[PDB]
Amino acid sequence: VGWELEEVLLLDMSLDDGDSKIQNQLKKLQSPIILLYCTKEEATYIFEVAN
């Protein structure tokens, strides 16, 4: 099966006031499908940044 994996972006939210730092990393996504793996409340932070 012909797959194509682009990014394995590793996020981090223990940094203080790191919202800017996590913003640049997430912009480097140009794929139709994203396989997100995080925690329920961590997803809200990620989705809001994506929002």
């Binding site: 913003q23 640049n24 912009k27 480097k28």
Partner: protein
């Protein structure tokens, strides 16, 4: 916010958006290219004479 300002992206802009070249709204990307009327070289006294 999307990511089309730096890296290999240069924006070319008319003199309308540049406007007052003395004030930069701090939201224009660095390396912005604009075409503007020649005010620095030839001043007002030349314009009135012309």
């Amino acid at each position: 916010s999307v990511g089309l300002t730096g890296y290999g992206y240069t924006w070319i802009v008319p003199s309308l958006v540049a406007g007052d070249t003395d004030t930069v709204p701090a939201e224009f990307p660095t390396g912005l290219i604009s075409v503007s009327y020649d005010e620095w070289d030839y001043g007002l006294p030349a314009r009135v004479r012309d």
